[PDB]
C-alpha cells in the first residue's frame, strides 16, 4: 500500500500487520 | 444509541477522533478511514 | 485506582495504554499474551467529501515518520 | 544487537565503520520505491548492492556474501521461523518502519467494496483470522 498504487486502484481493508525490516545474520 | 455514537447519529458530532474500537456493529451505521494504531487487548495485574 | 489498592485482580484493556501505565509505575504488570490484533480508526459520518482525503492524509503520515514522532513525544516516552 | 533501524549511523556512509558492509533489495520491488522517495542517496549506495533472487540473498547471508538484507516483515520472518540453526536474525518488530497493512486491489469504484471489508472485518472479528496465522506462521523460541 502507497501512494502510486492507490491513485490507479482502490484497496480494501487490511488484515496482516506488517511492515518492512533488515535482515542480518 | 448513547455516547459518542448517540452524540454522532444525532447530528451533534460531525467526527468522532477517539481511540475508537473498529468493529462489524459500529462500522454497520459509519464510516472509517484506515487504521492509525495496530493494538490489542491485554490484562493488568499488581 | 481499585486495582492499585489491590481491590482488583484482572482488567482487560488496550495493549499501548497499559504499556505506557507501566512504564509510568513499575507497580503496574501485565500479561504476555496478545490478542484481537485489530486498529483504531476515527468515527466518521456516513458517506462524504470528508472521507477520502482524510484517509488518504492517514496514508501518506503512516508512510514518513510523523508517527515516529508522535509516539517519541507519548507512547515510546518511559520512565 | 548491532543495528537500531533506518537511522543508524551505518547508513550515512559504509566507510564510516571499519568493515564496508553490504545490503541490497529485491529489483524491481516495491521497496525499492520507497528508499528512492525518503533517501535517493541509499538507492545510490543499494545500487552496487542489488541482488536477484530471495532466496539468493538468503543464500548470500548465510553463506556470507552479503551483511544485512532488506525485505517485508512478515516474509522475512516466515523464513526465520523454520530456518535450521537461526543464524540470520530479524531487527525489531516493524518500530521504526512502514506499519502499514495488505490489501487486495480492486477495480475503481468496484460495488463488491462493502461486501468484501464486512467479510473480512469479521474474519478478524471472530477469531477464524487467528487460526489461519497458526496454519501458516511457526514463532519458535
Redesign the interface.
Known amino acids: 500500500i502507497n501512494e502510486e498504487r492507490s491513485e490507479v486502484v482502490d484497496f480494501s481493508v487490511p488484515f496482516v500487520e506488517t511492515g518492512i525490516s533488515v535482515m542480518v545474520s | 444509541w448513547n455516547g459518542?455514537?448517540g452524540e454522532?447519529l444525532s447530528g451533534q458530532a460531525?467526527?468522532?477522533?477517539?481511540?475508537?474500537?473498529?468493529?462489524?456493529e459500529r462500522?454497520?451505521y459509519?464510516?472509517?478511514?484506515?487504521?492509525?494504531?495496530?493494538?490489542?487487548?491485554?490484562?493488568?495485574?499488581? | 485506582q481499585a486495582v492499585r489498592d489491590n481491590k482488583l485482580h484482572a482488567f482487560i484493556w488496550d495493549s499501548a495504554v497499559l504499556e505506557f501505565e507501566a512504564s509510568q509505575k513499575c507497580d503496574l504488570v501485565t500479561t504476555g499474551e496478545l490478542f484481537f490484533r485489530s486498529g483504531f480508526g476515527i468515527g466518521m459520518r456516513k458517506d462524504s467529501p470528508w472521507k477520502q482525503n482524510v484517509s488518504l492524509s492517514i496514508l501518506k503520515s503512516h508512510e514518513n515518520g510523523f508517527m515516529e514522532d508522535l509516539d517519541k513525544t507519548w507512547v515510546r516516552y518511559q520512565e | 544487537d548491532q543495528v537500531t533501524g533506518l537511522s543508524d549511523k551505518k547508513f550515512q556512509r559504509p566507510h564510516d565503520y571499519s568493515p564496508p558492509f553490504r545490503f541490497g533489495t529485491v529489483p524491481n520491488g516495491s521497496t525499492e520505491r520507497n528508499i528512492r522517495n525518503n533517501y535517493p542517496y541509499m538507492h545510490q549506495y543499494m545500487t552496487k548492492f542489488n541482488q536477484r533472487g530471495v532466496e539468493d540473498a538468503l543464500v548470500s547471508l548465510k553463506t556470507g556474501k552479503l551483511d544485512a538484507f532488506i525485505y517485508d516483515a512478515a516474509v522475512l520472518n516466515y523464513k526465520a521461523g523454520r530456518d535450521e540453526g537461526c543464524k540470520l536474525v530479524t531487527i525489531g518488530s516493524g518500530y521504526i518502519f512502514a506499519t502499514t497493512g495488505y490489501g487486495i486491489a480492486l477495480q475503481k469504484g468496484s460495488p463488491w467494496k462493502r461486501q468484501i471489508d464486512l467479510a473480512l472485518l469479521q474474519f478478524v472479528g471472530d477469531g477464524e483470522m487467528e487460526e489461519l496465522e497458526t496454519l501458516w506462521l511457526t514463532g519458535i523460541c
Do not use: C, R
Open positions: 459518542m455514537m454522532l460531525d467526527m468522532i477522533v477517539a481511540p475508537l474500537t473498529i468493529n462489524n462500522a454497520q459509519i464510516e472509517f478511514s484506515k487504521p492509525f494504531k495496530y493494538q490489542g487487548l491485554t490484562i493488568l495485574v499488581k
